[PDB]
Each structure stands twice: as C-alpha cells, then as structure tokens.
A paper describes a structure:
EndoBT-3987 is a secreted enzyme that initiates the HM degradation pathway and hydrolyzes the oligosaccharide from its polypeptide chain on the cell surface. ENGases are endoglycosidases that hydrolyze the chitobiose core of N-linked glycans (EC 3.2.1.96). Residues 26–41 were not visible in the structure. The full-length EndoBT-3987 comprises two domains from the N- to the C-terminus: (i) a β-sandwich domain (42–179) followed by a short linker (residues 180–193) that continues to (ii) a GH domain (residues 194–476). Here, we provide the high-resolution X-ray crystal structures of EndoBT-3987 in its unliganded form, in complex with its substrate, Man9GlcNAc2Asn, and two of its products, Man5GlcNAc and Man9GlcNAc.
The strategy for capturing a native binary enzyme-product complex was to perform co-crystallization experiments with the full-length EndoBT-3987 (EndoBT-3987WT) in the presence of Man5GlcNAc2Asn or Man9GlcNAc2Asn substrates. Two crystal forms were obtained for the EndoBT-3987WT-GlcNAcMan9 complex, in space groups P1 (EndoBT-3987WT-Man9GlcNAc-1) and P 21 21 21 (EndoBT-3987WT-Man9GlcNAc-2), and the corresponding crystal structures solved at 2.0 and 1.7 Å resolution, respectively. The overall protein scaffold and the conformation of the EndoBT-3987WT-Man5GlcNAc (r.m.s.d. of 0.35 Å for 397 residues), EndoBT-3987WT-Man9GlcNAc-1 (r.m.s.d. of 0.48 Å for 397 residues) and EndoBT-3987WT-Man9GlcNAc-1 (r.m.s.d. of 0.41 Å for 397 residues) crystal structures were essentially preserved with respect to the EndoBT-3987D312A/E314L-Man9GlcNAc2Asn substrate complex.
Residue numbers in the entry: 46 to 476
The structure:
Amino acid sequence: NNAYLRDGKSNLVSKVVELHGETYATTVKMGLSKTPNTATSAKVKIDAAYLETYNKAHNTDFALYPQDLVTFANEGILTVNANTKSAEVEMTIRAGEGLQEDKTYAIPVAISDQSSDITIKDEDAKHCIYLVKDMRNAGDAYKGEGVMQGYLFFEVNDVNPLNTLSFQLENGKLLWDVVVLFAANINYDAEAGRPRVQCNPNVQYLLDNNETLLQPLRRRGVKVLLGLLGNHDITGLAQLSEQGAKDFAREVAQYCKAYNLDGVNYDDEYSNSPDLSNPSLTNPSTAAAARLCYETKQAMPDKLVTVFDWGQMYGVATVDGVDAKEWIDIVVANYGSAAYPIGQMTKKQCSGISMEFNLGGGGSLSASKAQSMIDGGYGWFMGFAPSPAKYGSVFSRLQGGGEVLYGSNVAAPTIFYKKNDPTPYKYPDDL
Ligand SMILES: CC(=O)N[C@@H]1[C@@H](O)[C@H](O[C@@H]2O[C@H](CO[C@H]3O[C@H](CO[C@H]4O[C@H](CO)[C@@H](O)[C@H](O)[C@@H]4O[C@H]4O[C@H](CO)[C@@H](O)[C@H](O)[C@@H]4O)[C@@H](O)[C@H](O[C@H]4O[C@H](CO)[C@@H](O)[C@H](O)[C@@H]4O[C@H]4O[C@H](CO)[C@@H](O)[C@H](O)[C@@H]4O)[C@@H]3O)[C@@H](O)[C@H](O[C@H]3O[C@H](CO)[C@@H](O)[C@H](O)[C@@H]3O[C@H]3O[C@H](CO)[C@@H](O)[C@H](O)[C@@H]3O[C@H]3O[C@H](CO)[C@@H](O)[C@H](O)[C@@H]3O)[C@@H]2O)[C@@H](CO)O[C@H]1O
Ligand SMILES: [Ca+2]
C-alpha cells in the first residue's frame, strides 16, 4: 500500500500559504493506493531535517517556520478512511510576532509511525511542505476567501505599472491581485552560444528603479511578475532542451530574487525556428514548454509560475512524474477564450475572461459575466495593456462585475502615473 502526503485543502504536495489573519487551518492528507485494513495507522510530524534536503534540492534558503506556531489536532494521528483511500488530520498555522515580512518560511511535514502495511516510495512521497508568507500587512489587494482574482499585463514600453493603484473597489480594496511587466525577452547570446534573458531599455529601467516603481505595489499586496516573451531569434520558451530549460529557469529565478519579484509569465510567441544542433535548444513542443515551467517552479517554488495559453506553451500535464498543478499556478487565455485546466488543476487556476484593454476585444467584466465565471468555478479574470489615456473605455468594461464578485463595484479612477515617474497624478485633471 503506497502512501504519500499532500495538503488536503488544495491537494498540493507543495503549498504556498499566505497569512491574512491570525490563523490558517487546513488538513494534511495521506493518500493510499489500496484500501486500508483495520490496523492501518500513521501520524504526521514536523520534520525539520527534511528542510535541509529540500533547500539543497531547490537551491533555496527557506527558514523553518516557528514550530510552536503549528498545531495538529488529535496528537498528529491521521484518521484513516478506508472508503476514500486516505487519512487526514487538522493542522493550524498561527501567525506569529517573530515573523519578518517579505520572507518565506517552510513547514516540512512527514508521515511518521506508519503501520507496516504502508510503503513510502521516497522522501518526496514521505513529506509535503508548506511555504508560509505573512501577508497580514500586504492586505490591500486581498478581497476575501475564495473570490475571483485579477491578473493584469502592463505594456511597460508605454505605461507605468504603478497605474495598478488606479484600480480600487468602492470599499477601497485594490482590484488587480497579480500584475505582469510585459515583457522581458528570451534571446540568443551568440557570443556565448546560449539563451539569455534580454531586457529592453524600458524593462531594464523598471528593474533598475524597482525600489520606487515596483516595490510600492508589492507593499500593498500586489504580486509583480516578470513577463517573458519570445523575440525573433532561434530561442523560445517552448523550444529549450532539458539542460537549456534548467539553465534558463535558473536565470529567471535569479532575476526574481535579485529584484524581489513574485514570479513569471511565459508567453510562447514571436520566436523563430530553433537551431537543433544547439544543446540548449530542441524541437518546439508542449513537452519542452512544460519542462521549462517545471524547472522554473523547482528553482523558485514559493513564487508564481504562470503561462499565457498561446503558441505551444500549455498542454502537457506531467514532467518527471510531477503533475502540472504543482508547477502551473495560473493559466490565462487569449482574448475571447477561457483557459482550461490540465492534470489535477481546477478552473481555480484558470482565467474565465481575457480583456484586451488597448484594442477592445475579449468582452467585459459585467455582472452577468462575473456570475457566469463564478458559476463555472473560474479563479481569474485577465486584462491586457490598460493606459490612463483609455481609462474611460477600460473602466466602462469593469462595471457591475465587482458587485457580483466582491459586493463592491470598481470605483472611478482618481490617480494615474506617467511613464517612469513615481508621482501619483490626479486623474483626469493632470492628463
Ligand atoms: C499576453 C498577450 O497579449 N500576448 C500577445 C501580445 O504580444 C500582443 O501584443 C501586441 O504585439 C504586437 C507584436 O509585438 C511583437 O512584434 C513587434 C514587432 O516586431 C517586428 O518589428 C520590429 C521592428 O519594428 C523587429 O525588431 C522585430 O524583429 C519584428 O520584425 C519582423 O517584422 C517587421 C515588420 O513589422 C520586419 O521589418 C522584420 O524584418 C521582421 O519580419 C515587436 O515590437 C514586439 O516587441 C516589443 O514589445 C515587447 C512587449 O510588447 C517587448 O517584450 C519587446 O522587447 C519589444 O519592445 C522593444 O522593442 C520595440 C521595437 O520593436 C521598442 O519599440 C520598445 O520600446 C522596446 O525596446 C513584439 O515582439 C505589437 O505590435 C503590439 O504593439 C502595439 O500595441 C502596444 C500596446 O498593446 C503598443 O505598446 C505598441 O506601440 C503597438 O501600438 C501600435 O499598434 C496598436 C494596434 O496594434 C495601436 O493601438 C497603437 O496605438 C499603435 O498604433 C499606431 O502605430 C502603428 C505603428 O506602430 C500604426 O500602424 C497605427 O496605425 C497607429 O498609428 C502589441 O504589443 C497582444 C495583442 O492583443 O496579444 C498577444 O498576441
Ligand atoms: Ca498594509
């Protein structure tokens, strides 16, 4: 009887927990491959030694969440359920006064004292892990448990991402949970014969000026992602070999670490055919795209790995035996479509609408559409390329939906930002 451990609320082996209050309650669930017998038993425990193994495997440095803040019900004993081939125990995570903001802590949980009828294949199957972030002060985008969330791309060539702050509900909450700096590029470094991250001068300016133009968003609870995009040479996000994907994933994670960002969006577009003789490249395919997503999540497991569903970026649901739910946090679709889940993903990881704010296509976040997306179980609505000059049209496309999603409509904007300028100007007076 093979067993493994995962978070019961999410069914994820590796679960990022954002604390918005003093406690967070879930279950830890042991899955069994066969119906258990009357004597089958197991417990769970915090396994601090496994954190060293985990940090080494991922080249990360997460600190151990204070154990005194984590409590299991029932002495950590798993209640075995023969009918669902599983066993669970309640786990509570308390927010602590010794915690540092903008730091990820780890709770490695292990199966322990299991009965002799249970087989645990490896140390990965023995453990699940919670990656805990205290977000109590980064609350301004948090609109509630289980609500739909916003995902917004800025064309940073033209528009300052501080304009995220122009979008609030009437109750003062910020609309857009996640924003993308669209976009850094993948390009060939001919002199080195390898792919590299290549940043245009507009992208580079934001990174250089991260403290004033990007970190104020993160202070308010907005996740800031680096967009990655193909860029008219032999390299592309769906045509890296296994080694090329490992190398590029390491570079992307270094950008997110160096600049204190929250993850990436991958958009497989505008690349040319690869040079198949280059050991960093391979045939363009969803298998290569999935490999890159998987390797990027392994290099930054606490951060978001997200894809635009375009080109060959999305569709393979397993890499090295690991399901896509573990390494695709959000998938957003092309304007006019809804994203769909693969593997054990649900529609909570999918956009139900994508709105092209610059060209007009893709529909509106109306009361009717909001209700439709909730009824369908979608987790996200996506928008692309808003600009202060078009706020009239943009905000007309956000009426009614906020009342359905949050009990509070989107408010008319009163602030906007000019490119590369940190000053919140008055909208529309300063236009
Ligand atoms: C998610 C998601 O939505 N994903 C995608 C998303 O990508 C789409 O977004 C649009 O993408 C298209 C395509 O972008 C890519 O290609 C362009 C063009 O690349 C080619 O030309 C370059 C030379 O000019 C070459 O360097 C390059 O190799 C390509 O060459 C081929 O083709 C040319 C001929 O065109 C041949 O000569 C070549 O030989 C070869 O065949 C490219 O510019 C883009 O890359 C830039 O932007 C991305 C981010 O978007 C960055 O990551 C890149 O680093 C890069 O930026 C840097 O370089 C550029 C120069 O290329 C610098 O200007 C910049 O400062 C950086 O340094 C992509 O690779 C785009 O065309 C769309 O752009 C328009 O909209 C955006 C806003 O959304 C504007 O910011 C932008 O200015 C464009 O706006 C014009 O068009 C709009 C209508 O489409 C209109 O609303 C605007 O008002 C404006 O229109 C006015 O000007 C027009 C002339 O430009 C004029 O014709 C018109 O009448 C108006 O007067 C947009 O980004 C979206 C779309 O919904 O969906 C998905 O597909
Ligand atoms: Ca705060």
